[PDB]
Ligand binder design. Structure first.
Ligand SMILES: [Mg+2]
Ligand SMILES: [Mg+2]
Ligand SMILES: [Mg+2]
Ligand SMILES: [Mg+2]
Ligand SMILES: [Mg+2]
Ligand SMILES: [Mg+2]
Ligand SMILES: [Mg+2]
Ligand SMILES: [Mg+2]
Ligand SMILES: [Mg+2]
Ligand SMILES: [Mg+2]
Ligand SMILES: [Mg+2]
Ligand SMILES: [Mg+2]
Ligand SMILES: [Mg+2]
Ligand SMILES: [Mg+2]
Ligand SMILES: [Mg+2]
Ligand SMILES: [Mg+2]
Ligand SMILES: [Mg+2]
Ligand SMILES: [Mg+2]
Ligand SMILES: [Mg+2]
Lengths: 175, 75, 187, 159, 168
RNA sequence: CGCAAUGAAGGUGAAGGCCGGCGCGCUCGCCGGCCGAGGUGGGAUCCCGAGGCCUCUCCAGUCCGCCGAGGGCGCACCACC
RNA sequence: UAUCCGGUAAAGCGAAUGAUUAGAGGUCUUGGGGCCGAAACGAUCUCAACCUAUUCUCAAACUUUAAAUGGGUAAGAAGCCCGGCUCGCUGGCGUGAGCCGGGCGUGGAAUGGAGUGCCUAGUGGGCCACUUUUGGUAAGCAGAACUGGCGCUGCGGGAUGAACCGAACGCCGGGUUAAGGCGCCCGAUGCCGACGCUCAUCAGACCCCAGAAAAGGUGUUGGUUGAUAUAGACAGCAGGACGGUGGCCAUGGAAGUCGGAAUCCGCUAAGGAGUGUGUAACAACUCACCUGCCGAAUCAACUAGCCCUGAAAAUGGAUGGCGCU
RNA sequence: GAAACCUCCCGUGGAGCAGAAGGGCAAAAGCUCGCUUGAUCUUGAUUUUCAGUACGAAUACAGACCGUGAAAGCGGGGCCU
RNA sequence: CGUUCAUAGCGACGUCGCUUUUUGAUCCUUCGAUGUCGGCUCUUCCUAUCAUUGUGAAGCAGAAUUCACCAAGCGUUGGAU
RNA sequence: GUCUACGGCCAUACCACCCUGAACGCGCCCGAUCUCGUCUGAUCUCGGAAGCUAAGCAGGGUCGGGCCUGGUUAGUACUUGGAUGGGAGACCGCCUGGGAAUACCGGGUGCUGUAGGCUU
């Protein structure tokens, strides 16, 4: 796995039928990935671990992108992880605040790279669950839960440093 | 002044320049190394095939006539 | 960059004859033309043979030419031979033949013509039959040359029957250690 | 540099399997090889007369000669750059019929059945084999019950 | 659920060069006629064929071509093998002359034989000289790594069509 | 030098078949006639060739091709007997 | 696609061989030493080997199992199916072989024109990388396997460079790429690039590669697990820390206190038969439970990111340089 | 008497098979008897080392002359390396 | 261990490192030759600091001291064999 | 239903103990004149047929051992191919395909060929 910005995918698949097992059970997952191609691969990786079931032994039935049903709501997402350290493998519960699951998992993948130099292929996302104002354990999230939120944008450092590469005016950063 | 002692390093390559050809199969291989007592007897059998020729030729003519009668009955 | 071996890209067959003689080269000019413009593959085979070496176009003996035309059905035909026709002193009665050859030896010439045979040159064969129709294309035995008796699995290599290059045959030229059982071993 | 001895390294190869020592049971001996039978060589420890060399164990080849209680058998042995078809005189006990050929003969027999019939009918039938084609279009009924969700399980250290 | 058919046919582009390449790979790559880098071929899929692609995975990018892909490849870079001389399919007199003994008498017929993988696929596909495509405009992601893991190699199924457009 | 070998040597030295008859046809011995370098598989090439394929008409109909299913003689060379 | 071959990885040792831990059980045997016995398979232990279930941990020269990769064959005209002849072999009759004479055609995928013979030079110092691998503390050491390199070979990248990555060269125009990049040196970010992390009085800055470890750090950032607290805590200051009791072993002195077996009750609001200081030994001091004030979170133990300590070499110096927050 | 000899039971070989080790071996390939000289004479073929040369060592036959066994058979040295 | 007290100073059984002023390994370079030990003489660098400056430590009362830090500016001698 | 003789495959067929066996068989059994052989008529050889299923043999039984076959162990261990992935190393993760072995828990516990009986 690598990235870009992910998309939730639904992928349901089954170990393909036999004489002995005529109508085998379907298994569904939530597989975040940049595209269906790697989605299906990622589906197979997770299933292999859990169930005696390989890409040869099975058929993916329905892979399909899943759309955030409330895009223009701001939400808080709890996300449970399973990363690999340099040392042992771990569990976490991260929390992000975003407009989407995909966005919230994407956000996670960047954080984990930042905070733990953890690369995609090491991380397992288990559950991603949207959450209330309460049931938010992280204070970095909790500070934005407030009705009359109010802050300034204090030392507003400029970009467009090469529109006028040279100029008479020393700039301004108070607004 | 010790050497390298043995290797097989570049050898597979060397072999496969010119193929590794399978051993050229013919029909009708020799009877060299076949159990002598056999070979005597098949030699003798071969000796006397010309004995019992006139019988054999007639038998084929009788067969050919039976084939010609069968094909006439079909048509 | 492409992967092909350029190893056997050049085919080594002859194109023209290596000889510089002018009469043969005229035959080549004639049979090139016929080869290309006729459908006859006879012309192609003949053309191919005009480029070959002396070794490679061995002499065809009169007796060999007899018996090959004695064969059932190729009767009232013409035998063709890009090599030379030689005599056989060990044949007597010579049927009346039709023959093409680049050469025929003076004896072989007499014997054939005395029989009522016709001899043809290759320019004459073309006018007579430009598509090689009604011909028997023969060849001399390629592996006649004493040369070949030294070729093969080497002498002193079990089950080879390959003449060794020896200065002179005789009691004491080879035939010791490696042929007798009494002397070392044998192959 | 290793020893050139005939039996070097056949500690395991020529060794009767676990609880199959003792008498060479008799079918082995009393089954008939003709000329041109495809036959796979497999040396055996109990019988040491007529043993093949360790190089021809595993190797399959054709029978060329049949003596009283052995079978001459041409087998191809590779040597660095050249494959040498060579003829070895194995005692029966080290030899089975190779089934490899029989599945072929079964198929040709089946073809001769399917060629005789389907001639008077007119409908020509697929005689050639064909590799496993891609697995066709089909429906899967999630009959009533929905799909089963699979969360990956949280790590824990067992040992 | 409607699980549609697994694909019949796939385009296979050789996406790395001709130096330091294992002998088993190299042989298969010259059984797909993928000698130069960025040559491509159509390839009918089946247990035999797919596994040959499995043995050359980090040497190729491949997958399931569109209809449009089969057209664009055939019209823009459609070259016959005609007396062993790579010759551009300028007219149907060329296709017919060679493939007309199969009922294939024009560029259009050819496209239908390639795309539906007909009876006469082997003979229409071999007739086509392997497609010399240019370099990938806009570049690649990574030559050496698999598609799934960010790179370009291996099966990318639907997405082989994007690559086709930026190379054809 | 080549056209004959093989044996250490004394020496010996490359034909067979068939048919009919006479000796018991004894897969052995002797007398008359005929063929005369054996046979299997593959073999470039020649040869024969059903049959098309038309001709400005309906049939007759020699001439000329083009192809040719099928079948033959089979060089060289190879493998086998 | 069928079909044989295998004894390496792994696994196993309540299966063999060999190794090896522990207790249960057993006068198996018997002993050697005991203690209580004159002595007694008497009682009681014990250690020896042996055994009955278990149990710990192993094997290049062990193994019941047993992969992956791997090596044979086979996938048709030299094949099938009929008819008849030959044999000095074989034989109750029949085998089996060899001959004639007919009858039947694409027999898995993909690719490619094949076969065959003669003359024949140079070479016979090698080395390097992935992976496997023997010797060795190790080596830019020595020795094998496997493929691919270098040698014979330029070109883009890796500042520099046999061998790394990319790619393999007729002589040129246009286009596009790879691997690598895009402050300036130096072609390209002079993007209003996105999200974090990190300040280093030794910062850090890209395969091969040219450099650091154990162990530490309320430095900062994430986790994990447990707490706690309105029965208003947590620290921050202030009040007590006893008696049954020189408790028992230890006397050389330990009444809580060199050590060790202990190790509970009372009063209780509550104080350990005691954290230390210190005493020859006490004493004296010091270290819960609770309040008074203050006013919301507090605190512990792990864990992993960057940063830091750990961190010493000789001409002046090298993320390539300039520099960069 | 821990060990002498006898007898009953259990005993997959934990013994033995000249020697190193590995394989193989139980109405045997072990032990004990009886009879023996196949450790004899003679062509080629093949395997193993291999260059696919030699040597040695071996394998299957074939022709003699024997051995042994009621016989089928086995035996031309040592169960195999 | 240091009366007492693991750590003022020490430090077993274990363990992780650096160094190339020891000696080995190794044999890459040089055998159409790179002058092979020591001393003298002279310059420069390193610090792993003996003294000297500034300081933390003690089982530092003073004196004497060892332990550590910044630190290589300046020194580090005369003789007998 | 089942046996005997000669078998094929060789434990689903072995071992232990327990029960039951009609008829025909198979046995044990009773003898040593002769054949044959022993220290010994135990074995071996031979001539029998009074007893008896006690034993062998068969069929069954046992929360039996063993063997055979499934599950689990486990997509775990291992592993083909890949990367300018990680990691100071040791090693590890991913991609691409392949994929075991105990303990533990189930089920099974001879099939059958030729020739001849018996249950008429
Ligand atoms: Mg050498
Ligand atoms: Mg070249
Ligand atoms: Mg690479
Ligand atoms: Mg081994
Ligand atoms: Mg192991
Ligand atoms: Mg040299
Ligand atoms: Mg060296
Ligand atoms: Mg050189
Ligand atoms: Mg490369
Ligand atoms: Mg013996
Ligand atoms: Mg004999
Ligand atoms: Mg002390
Ligand atoms: Mg040195
Ligand atoms: Mg000098
Ligand atoms: Mg210092
Ligand atoms: Mg008796
Ligand atoms: Mg009974
Ligand atoms: Mg009973
Ligand atoms: Mg049981």
């Amino acid at each position: 796995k690598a990235s870009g910005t992910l998309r939730e995918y639904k992928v349901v698949g089954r170990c393909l039928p036999t004489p002995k097992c005529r109508t085998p059970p379907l298994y569904r997952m939530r597989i975040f990935a940049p595209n269906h191609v790697v989605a299906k691969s990622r589906f197979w990786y997770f299933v292999s671990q859990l169930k005696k079931m390989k890409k040869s032994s099975g058929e993916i039935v329905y892979c399909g992108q899943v759309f955030e049903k409330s895009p223009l709501r701001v939400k808080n997402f709890g996300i449970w992880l399973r990363y690999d350290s340099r040392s042992g493998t771990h569990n976490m519960y991260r929390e992000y605040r975003d407009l989407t699951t995909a966005g919230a998992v994407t956000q996670c993948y960047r954080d984990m790279g930042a905070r733990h130099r953890a690369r995609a292929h090491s991380i397992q996302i288990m559950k991603v669950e949207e959450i209330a104002a309460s049931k938010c354990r992280r204070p970095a999230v909790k500070q934005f839960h407030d009705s009359k939120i109010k802050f300034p944008l204090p030392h507003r450092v400029l970009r467009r440093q090469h529109k006028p590469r040279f100029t008479t005016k020393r700039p301004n950063t108070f607004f | 002044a010790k050497s390298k002692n043995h290797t097989t390093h570049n050898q597979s390559r060397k072999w496969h320049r010119n193929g590794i050809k399978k051993p050229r199969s013919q029909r009708y291989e020799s009877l060299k190394g076949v159990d002598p007592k056999f070979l005597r007897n098949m030699r003798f059998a071969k000796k006397h095939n010309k004995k019992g020729l006139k019988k054999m030729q007639a038998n084929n003519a009788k067969a050919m006539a039976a084939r010609a009668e069968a094909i006439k009955a079909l048509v | 960059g492409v992967d092909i071996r350029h190893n056997k890209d050049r085919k080594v067959r002859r194109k023209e004859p290596k000889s510089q003689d002018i009469y043969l080269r005229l035959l080549v000019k004639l049979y090139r033309f016929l080869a290309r413009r006729t459908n006859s593959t006879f012309n192609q085979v003949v053309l191919k043979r005009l480029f070959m070496s002396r070794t490679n176009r061995p002499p065809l003996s009169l007796s060999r030419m007899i018996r090959k035309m004695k064969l059932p059905g190729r009767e009232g035909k013409t035998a063709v031979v890009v090599g030379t026709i030689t005599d056989d002193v060990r044949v007597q009665e010579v049927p009346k033949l039709k023959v093409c050859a680049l050469r025929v030896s003076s004896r072989a010439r007499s014997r054939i013509l005395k029989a009522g045979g016709k001899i043809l040159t290759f320019d004459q064969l073309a006018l007579d039959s430009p598509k090689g129709c009604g011909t028997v294309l023969l060849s001399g035995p390629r592996k006649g040359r004493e040369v070949y008796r030294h070729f093969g699995k080497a002498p002193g290599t079990p089950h080879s029957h390959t003449k060794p290059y020896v200065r002179s045959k005789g009691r004491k030229f080879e035939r010791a250690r490696g042929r007798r059982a009494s002397r070392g071993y044998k192959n | 540099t290793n020893t050139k001895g005939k039996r070097r390294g056949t500690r395991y190869m020529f060794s009767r399997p676990f609880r199959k020592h003792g008498v060479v049971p008799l079918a082995t001996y009393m089954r008939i090889y003709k000329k041109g039978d495809i036959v796979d060589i497999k040396g055996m420890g109990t019988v040491q007369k007529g043993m093949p060399h360790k190089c021809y164990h595993g190797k399959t080849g054709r029978v060329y000669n049949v003596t009283q209680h052995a079978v001459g058998i041409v087998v191809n042995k590779q040597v660095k750059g050249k494959i040498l078809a060579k003829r070895i005189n194995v005692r029966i006990e080290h030899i089975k019929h190779s089934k490899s050929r029989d599945s072929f003969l079964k198929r040709v027999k089946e073809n001769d059945q399917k060629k005789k019939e389907a001639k008077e009918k007119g409908t020509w039938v697929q005689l050639k084999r064909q590799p496993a084609p891609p697995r066709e279009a089909h429906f899967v009924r999630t009959n009533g019950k929905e799909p089963e969700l699979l969360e990956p399980i949280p790590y824990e250290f067992m040992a | 659920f409607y699980v549609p058919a697994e694909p019949k046919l796939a385009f296979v582009i050789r996406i790395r060069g001709i130096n330091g390449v294992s002998p088993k790979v190299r042989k298969v790559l010259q059984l797909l006629r993928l000698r130069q880098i960025f040559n491509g071929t159509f390839v009918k899929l089946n247990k035999a064929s797919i596994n040959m692609l499995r043995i050359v995975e980090p040497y190729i990018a491949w997958g399931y071509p569109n209809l449009k892909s089969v057209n664009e490849l055939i019209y823009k870079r459609g070259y016959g093998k005609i007396n062993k001389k790579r010759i551009a399919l300028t007219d149907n007199a060329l296709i017919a002359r060679s493939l007309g003994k199969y009922g294939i008498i024009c560029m259009e017929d050819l496209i239908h034989e390639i795309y539906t993988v007909g009876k006469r696929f082997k003979e229409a596909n071999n007739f086509l000289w392997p497609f010399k495509l240019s370099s990938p405009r806009g570049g690649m992601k990574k030559k050496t790594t698999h598609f799934v893991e960010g790179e370009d190699a291996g099966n990318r199924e639907d997405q082989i069509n994007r690559l086709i457009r930026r190379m054809n």
